[PDB]
Each structure stands twice: as structure tokens, then as C-alpha cells.
Amino acid sequence: SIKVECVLRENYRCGESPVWEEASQSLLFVDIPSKIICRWDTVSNQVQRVAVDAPVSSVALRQLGGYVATIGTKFCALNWENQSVFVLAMVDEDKKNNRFNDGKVDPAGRYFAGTMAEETAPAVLERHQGSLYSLFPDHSVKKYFDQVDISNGLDWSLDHKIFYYIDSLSYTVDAFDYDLQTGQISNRRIVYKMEKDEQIPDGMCIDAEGKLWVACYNGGRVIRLDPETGKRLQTVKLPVDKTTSCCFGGKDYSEMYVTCARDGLNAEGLLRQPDAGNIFKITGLGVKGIAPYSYAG
Ligand SMILES: OC[C@H]1O[C@@H](O)[C@H](O)[C@@H](O)[C@@H]1O
Ligand SMILES: OC[C@H]1O[C@@H](O)[C@H](O)[C@@H](O)[C@@H]1O
Ligand SMILES: OC[C@H]1O[C@@H](O)[C@H](O)[C@@H](O)[C@@H]1O
Ligand SMILES: [Ca+2]
């Protein structure tokens, strides 16, 4: 009784960073090269978009009101009403051609996000140019580690002592010891090795049983992993190859939303994947996810 359905047919170039906003029953996400932050009201079925002046790679809820996003190499704050967007902090001013990629807020309201050299084609870029950062409620920025190829999916264990992290071109899901009170991490190790047919690990979220779900870019699937054993538990395929990310949403976080891309597909690829770029929902997984945390600054 697992069902995969295409639920929003808007043909995004590279849908990414899905987050469920329970208060409005809306899905927030981005379409990266289209430079828009999107909010899809699942009830009225209307989509609203805020255009920004650079590629926008993630979006998160802002506790005091509105949203935050990573635009270019800048952490930004958004007031949805006035469509006002302003800079909270800048990173990689060091770099001629970087951008943020995936980001998510930690259980203490810190906005974690990492960067990458900009691509000329999917996974074609100058190597090791990224770093992982976090924006504290302070608006101060902590830099964690560099030498990242493409900073990607991330989440936190339910006990808040472990941080899970994907650098896409490492083809592994990694884990760190994590301290909730300070936001520090330590002891990086591999917890899952991607198989060849699982292609590039991209976005990731944890479920209520502590298992990890990873979107497989080019693999046309999400997989469920046990970070304690390093074994895959489950695979769910989708009719689009460039599955980018996933999050839980809907009633009690019982439904999974999956984003995907059409960028990089040739004419044949497009015809073979008519729903490339659209938003998918997966029902009947038999597990629930958890609420997103809101940024505390
Ligand atoms: O800045 C505006 C936003 O503030 C949030 O706290 C509300 O949940 C959104 O519906 C609103 O659009
Ligand atoms: O060396 C200085 C540079 O270090 C980088 O890691 C930071 O992101 C830059 O913003 C800073 O200017
Ligand atoms: O690494 C696979 C893909 O992951 C996405 O998060 C990035 O935005 C893309 O640029 C990248 O090609
Ligand atoms: Ca991604």
C-alpha cells in the first residue's frame, strides 16, 4: 500500500530543500537556478513565489516570523508579506564562484548550511571548495570543516547527540558526535556506503524511529538506512531519475514529499520522464517523520 503520486506539476528546473509548514499546511522549497523560493498551499493548491537575485539553495522556517534562506553564499531573512529579503551573514567571500547548497535547522534553532563550487554540469566543478557552516541565533557564523565537494543532506539523531551529513561526491552518509548546547561536532565516521545503482546521495531526513531516508540523485529512488548497522532497510522508486531531496509532512508527518530536477536531461530524457521537475508525494511508508525546527534568530 505504498503509493507514489505526482502532486504538483510545475516543471521546476531543480526542486530542492522541501520543508513542511504545519501552521499553513504548506510545502516550502526552492527551485535553485530559477532563483525562486516557493510556498505551496496544499489546501487551496496555490503556489506563491519569491524571486531572489541569485541561486537559492535552501529555505527554513524562522521562529520569530517568516523564513530564512541561503541565496548565493549569503544567509538571508525573508518577510513574506513585504517580500523583503535581507542579509544576516555572508560566507566564502574568499571564493570567486561558490554558492550554498543544502541546509537545515538543528534542534537548538541553528541554521546549518554548506557550500560548493558552482557547477558547469551536474557533478562537474572545481573540487573541495565547499565548507559546512552554521548560523547561530546570534547571527554569528561557525565554520565546521572545509574540503567539501558538494555539501548536501543533513539531519540530527532523535537524542540530539549525533549529526548526520552528506557530501554528495563522497558517496557516503557520515556521522559526527554532536553537542546540542554548543552546536559543536566531532568524530566524523562513515555510517552508510552508497551502492553503485544508488548513484549520488543528495537530500536526507530522519524518521521517528531514527532511520535515515536519502534521495538518490540519478538513482530515481529514496532509500531507508539504519545508521547503527550501515544496512539499507528499504528502497522506493520514482518515475523520475533526478530525485533531489525528501521530507515528511502532512497529517502527523505521515506523508513524504520528494523533490526532483529536469536540468541535465537531454530531449530523450525529458520525454522518458514527463514529470521531471515536479513534486512527488509518497504515502503508506508505515513510519512518520518529525517536525522541522525553526531558526532561532
Ligand atoms: O513573514 C510571514 C510569515 O510568518 C510566518 O510565521 C507565518 O507562519 C507565515 O504564514 C507568514 O507568511
Ligand atoms: O580566509 C578568510 C575567509 O575564510 C572563509 O572560510 C570564510 O568563509 C570567508 O568569508 C573568509 O573571508
Ligand atoms: O550533487 C547532486 C546535486 O545536488 C543538488 O543538491 C545540487 O544543488 C546540484 O547542483 C547537484 O548536482
Ligand atoms: Ca541537494
The domains of the chain are located at 1-297
Tell me the C-alpha to C-alpha distance, in Å, between residue 124 and each of 46, 150, 215. 35, 10, 19
Question: For this experimental structure, what is the resolution in angstroms?
Answer: 2.0
Closest by Cα among 270, 215, 204 to 238: 215
How far is C-alpha 59 from the geometric centre of its chain's CA atoms? Answer: 9
Closest by Cα among 77, 62, 58, 218 to 152: 58
Are 178 and 136 in contact by the 8 Å Cβ rule? The answer is no
Q: Please state, in angstroms and rounded to a whole number, the distance separating the CA atoms of residues 234 and 48.
A: 34
Cα angle for residues 181, 58, 197 (degrees, 5° grid): 100
Q: Please state, in angstroms and rounded to a whole number, the distance separating the CA atoms of residues 230 and 151.
A: 21
Distance 250 CA to ligand 1 centre (A): 18
SS3 276: coil
Out of 106, 149, 155, 202, pick the active-site residue: 202
Are 121 and 264 in contact by the 8 Å Cβ rule? The answer is yes
The answer to whether the CB of 261 is under 6 A from ligand 2 is no
User: CB burial class (10 A; 0-12, 13-18, 19+) of residue 287?
Assistant: middle
**Helix H or strand E segment including 280:** strand 279-283
Are 94 and 115 in contact by the 8 Å Cβ rule? The answer is no
Strands (E) across 62-179 are located at 67-71, 74-79, 84-90, 98-105, 111-117, 130-135, 141-148, 151-156, 162-167, 172-179
Q: Please state, in angstroms and rounded to a whole number, the distance separating the CA atoms of residues 135 and 41.
A: 28
Are 102 and 203 in contact by the 8 Å Cβ rule? The answer is yes
Are 110 and 183 in contact by the 8 Å Cβ rule? The answer is yes
Q: Please state, in angstroms and rounded to a whole number, the distance separating the CA atoms of residues 146 and 114.
A: 9
Cβ-count burial 63-89 (b if 16+ within 10 Å, e if not): eeebbbbbbbbbbbbbeeeeeebeebb
Beta bridge partners of 104: 112
- Tell the CATH topology of 1-297: Neuraminidase (2.120.10)
User: CB burial class (10 A; 0-12, 13-18, 19+) of residue 249?
Assistant: buried
Written as one letter, the residue type at 82 is N
Technique used by the depositors: X-ray
The answer to whether the CB of 127 is under 6 A from ligand 2 is no
Are 224 and 233 in contact by the 8 Å Cβ rule? The answer is yes
Closest by Cα among 131, 154, 235, 144 to 202: 154
Distance 146 CA to ligand 2 centre (A): 11
Closest residue by Cα to atom 6, ligand 1, is 65
**Helix H or strand E segment including 49:** strand 46-51
Task: Confirm whether 202 is a catalytic residue.
Answer: yes
Q: Please state, in angstroms and rounded to a whole number, the distance separating the CA atoms of residues 4 and 258.
A: 10
Are 199 and 217 in contact by the 8 Å Cβ rule? The answer is yes
Are 162 and 179 in contact by the 8 Å Cβ rule? The answer is no
Closest residue by Cα to atom 4, ligand 1, is 66
User: CB burial class (10 A; 0-12, 13-18, 19+) of residue 258?
Assistant: buried
Pairing of strands 56-61, 141-148: unpaired
Pocket of ligand 3 (CB under 6 A): 16, 32, 101-102, 119, 122-123, 150, 152, 168, 200, 202, 217, 244
Cα angle for residues 160, 249, 150 (degrees, 5° grid): 60
> What is the residue whose three cell numbers read 523560493?
37
Are 285 and 256 in contact by the 8 Å Cβ rule? The answer is yes
Q: Please state, in angstroms and rounded to a whole number, the distance separating the CA atoms of residues 268 and 210.
A: 39
SS3 29: strand
Are 248 and 20 in contact by the 8 Å Cβ rule? The answer is yes
